Symmetry: C2
Subunit: 74 residues, 2 copies
């Protein structure tokens, strides 16, 4: 089963996105698909949020309010 969330890098941190990369999904969509092999992604509250990540991919912890807000588009 796949999942959605903020993928973490080797330093245990999320991928920041701001400015033009916060308004357009392209930057985060590229990171999500090419680096974490997810189905898609966009910038959700300052960090790249991905959809369709494989279950083994480490993602950042988040409150229910944040998760519900970020899950959109797939």
């Amino acid at each position: 089963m796949k999942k959605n969330g903020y993928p973490l890098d080797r330093n245990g941190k999320t991928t920041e996105c701001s400015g033009v990369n916060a308004i357009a999904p392209h930057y985060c969509n590229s990171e999500c698909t090419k680096v974490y092999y997810a189905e898609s992604g966009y910038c959700c509250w300052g960090a790249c949020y991905c959809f369709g990540l494989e279950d083994d991919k480490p993602i950042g912890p988040m409150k229910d309010i944040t998760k519900k807000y970020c899950d959109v588009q797939i």
Copy 2:
């Protein structure tokens, strides 16, 4: 067959999106799904762009550069 594009309203115009509704997909996603019965949507260059619109839904004309840029997420 479904299609993607800028749905037009009764006045033959697109749905404008700016400010917080240009940074977050929620506004346009709601319009796209609830008003035009599409699968999803987001703000692409100042207007709500929808995915999965039924073929009979009138959409705004756009150049190839704009279409390729907007098609992301589905």
